[PDB]
């Protein structure tokens, strides 16, 4: 019955742990010990964007590194021109509890979702010049946490009912379901080639999925609490996570285990968002203590602070050309650092 | 093209300043515990009540998006200890630490609560009612710091007078917040 299956599961976990341990030939700290440190990374606020009445839960850069979208909990979706701080669009939502937003890589669409369990797609390039809804996707039994466009016709959404899904926007129907988690799925990150993605959940584990076959390939367990953020390394062979234990960790897909830990004894608040610089040398991470920190991803040494917000930092992103960083926060202000 | 962008920004800003007026003059309420949106108006002031019945049983992630709500309406009828524990976890949350609670005791005994044998307020039902109210108030008045309070009520009828009560406690909440900001309370 159940006892035999539990014993076999314990034996398999022991075997996997032994196989992982046999590959710990060295550590990342030893290899990168003779590398010159980065120095001191000082950034200054360039722009401050003020149009939101309530707290901001999400943001996302456009692929041209100039336009970005932001979502706030007053029920508004605003598209900014970061260069001139002008507003291009302002979209009202049917639900005021919006928890995520995405920008299509072609720039023609925009998505959002939240506590209403629905992903809504908005057509920016209207023939008539007015932004109106294009499709509503309804197949989840829990709040929506993240969404990411694969192309103009596919989107991957993660939800609080412990599942992810791949959608078909034209027909508005689910294509595949990824069912392996045991808690709310909080984030996801697409690989650069968009053939795999990772997801972190509230069971303190992250999984690597394959889009084309819809299976789970690897499971990573290093954290001690819920995982709030996740991001891919630029070459797509590693990823970084941030959880509620005030630590960030770097995992490697080929070694199938954890490499580095980014923690300090003065930090006792959870991480809400992580991101990477263009070369993968810096690791940006937003915290609950109202400011972001810059880490040296190769040496695990803090190299800067981004302290300009008056409340919890909820979102964080770096442009595709790596020329600016945008951070939103619960005080309803976006700031662009450089 | 800069003129057209400036004009579009002007229209957006004009609409935003008009929407901010409606947003700030409305009071949003959460109705967890027991019994989606509902817009009702009492004495020319609009209220906006939400009920979150369509989710799962894990509350620690979607509860922190209700941190700017004016009040939380908690309806509570060992089913009592679970309600007490939920109240104690809501009260001490890091993000709901300045939210007031309007408590509706919808029910209107020593084996599960042994402290009842030595509690002094048919008078027996009033003693039981005030025991339960005192348990909830003993949780609330222990870690407040003065930024939120609890307003308990007894509700059992067809609820003909349950809407004026929320009005009255939402007025007291704002009056106390302003009096405390002016260093007067």
């Amino acid at each position, epitope marked *: 019955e159940l006892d035999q299956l539990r014993q076999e599961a314990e034996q398999l976990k022991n075997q996997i742990r032994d196989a992982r341990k046999a590959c710990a030939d060295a550590t990342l700290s030893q290899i990168t010990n003779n590398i010159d440190p980065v120095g001191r990374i000082q950034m200054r606020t360039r722009r401050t964007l003020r149009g939101h009445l309530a707290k901001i839960y999400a943001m996302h850069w456009g692929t041209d590194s100039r336009l970005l979208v932001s979502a706030s909990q007053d029920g508004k979706l605003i598209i900014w021109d970061s260069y001139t701080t002008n507003k291009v669009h302002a979209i009202p939502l049917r639900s005021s509890w919006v928890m995520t937003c995405a920008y299509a890589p072609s720039g023609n669409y925009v998505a959002c979702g939240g506590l209403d369990n629905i992903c809504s797609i908005y057509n920016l390039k209207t023939r008539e010049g007015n932004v109106r809804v294009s499709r509503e996707l309804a197949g989840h039994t829990g709040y929506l946490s993240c969404c990411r466009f694969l192309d103009d016709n596919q989107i991957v959404t993660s939800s609080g009912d412990t599942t992810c899904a791949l959608w078909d926007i034209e027909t508005g129907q689910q294509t595949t379901t990824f069912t392996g988690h045991t808690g709310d799925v909080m984030s996801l990150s697409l690989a650069p080639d968009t053939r795999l993605f990772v997801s972190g959940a509230c069971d303190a584990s992250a999984k690597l999925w394959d889009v084309r076959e819809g299976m789970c390939r690897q499971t990573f367990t290093g954290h001690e*609490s819920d995982i709030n953020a996740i991001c891919f390394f630029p070459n797509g062979n590693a990823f970084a996570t941030g959880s509620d234990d005030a630590t960030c960790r770097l995992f490697d897909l080929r070694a199938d285990q954890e490499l580095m830990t980014y923690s300090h004894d003065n930090i006792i608040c959870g991480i809400t968002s992580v991101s990477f610089s263009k070369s993968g040398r810096l690791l940006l991470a937003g915290y609950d203590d109202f400011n972001c920190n810059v880490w040296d991803a190769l040496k695990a040494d803090r190299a800067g602070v981004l302290a300009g917000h008056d409340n919890r930092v909820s979102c964080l992103g770096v442009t595709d050309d790596g020329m600016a960083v945008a951070t939103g926060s619960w005080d309803s202000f976006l700031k662009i650092w450089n | 093209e800069e003129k057209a962008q400036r004009e579009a920004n002007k229209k957006i800003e004009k609409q935003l300043q008009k929407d901010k007026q409606v947003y700030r003059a409305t009071h949003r309420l959460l109705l967890l515990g027991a019994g989606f949106e509902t817009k009702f108006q009492v004495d020319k002031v609009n209220f906006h009540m939400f009920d979150v019945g369509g989710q799962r049983d894990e509350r*620690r992630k979607w*509860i922190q998006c209700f941190n700017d709500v004016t009040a939380i309406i908690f309806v509570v009828a060992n089913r009592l200890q679970e309600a007490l524990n939920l109240f104690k976890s809501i009260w001490n949350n890091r993000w709901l630490r300045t939210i007031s609670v309007i408590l509706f005791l919808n029910k209107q005994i020593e084996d599960y609560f*042994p402290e009842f044998a030595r509690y002094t307020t048919d008078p027996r039902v009033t003693r039981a009612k005030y025991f339960i109210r005192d348990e909830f108030l003993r949780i609330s008045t222990a870690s407040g710091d003065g930024r939120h309070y609890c307003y308990p009520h007894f509700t059992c009828a067809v609820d003909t007078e349950n809407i004026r009560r929320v009005f009255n406690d939402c007025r007291d909440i704002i009056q106390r917040m302003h009096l405390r900001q002016y260093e007067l309370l």
Partner: nanobody, 126 residues
Framework: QVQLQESGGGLVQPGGSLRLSCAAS????????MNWVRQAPGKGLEWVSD????????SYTGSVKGRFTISRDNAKNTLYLQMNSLKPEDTAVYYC?????????????????????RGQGTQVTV
């Protein structure tokens, strides 16, 4: 990997005494508040006791107040529950839960159907 393994228990006569144990690994035991949760056969999960990060603050449910004692050992990473003066009602499966996040004063969702930071349980019969 956060693992909590409970041991101890079995069958006792009414008025007997047991001592449940919970060995923790995969996390720093000192920064979290731990609890005990039970599930009687036929009903849902019921909260029983909890203890603070240092052992200063302790709470019990009404039905077990006076005859259950909870204590923790931060050096050995163990959590104990002392059950004396047992009653025929106390037969259940006892779980060893944990607050979701460190340093917080609130335990959320500990008695949920699918909670990821609690053990597999030990059967106690009276």
């Amino acid at each position: 990997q956060v693992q909590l393994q409970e041991s101890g228990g079995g069958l006792v006569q009414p008025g007997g005494s047991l001592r449940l144990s919970c060995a923790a690994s995969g996390f720093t035991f000192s920064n979290y508040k731990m609890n005990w949760v039970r599930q009687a056969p036929g009903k849902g999960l019921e909260w029983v006791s909890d203890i603070s990060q240092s052992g200063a603050s302790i709470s019990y449910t009404g039905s077990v107040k006076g005859r259950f004692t909870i204590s923790r050992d931060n050096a050995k990473n163990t959590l104990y529950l002392q059950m004396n003066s047992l009653k025929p009602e106390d037969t259940a499966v006892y779980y060893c839960a944990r607050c979701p996040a460190p340093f917080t004063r609130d335990c959320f969702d500990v008695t949920s159907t699918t909670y990821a930071y609690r053990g597999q349980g030990t059967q106690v019969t009276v």
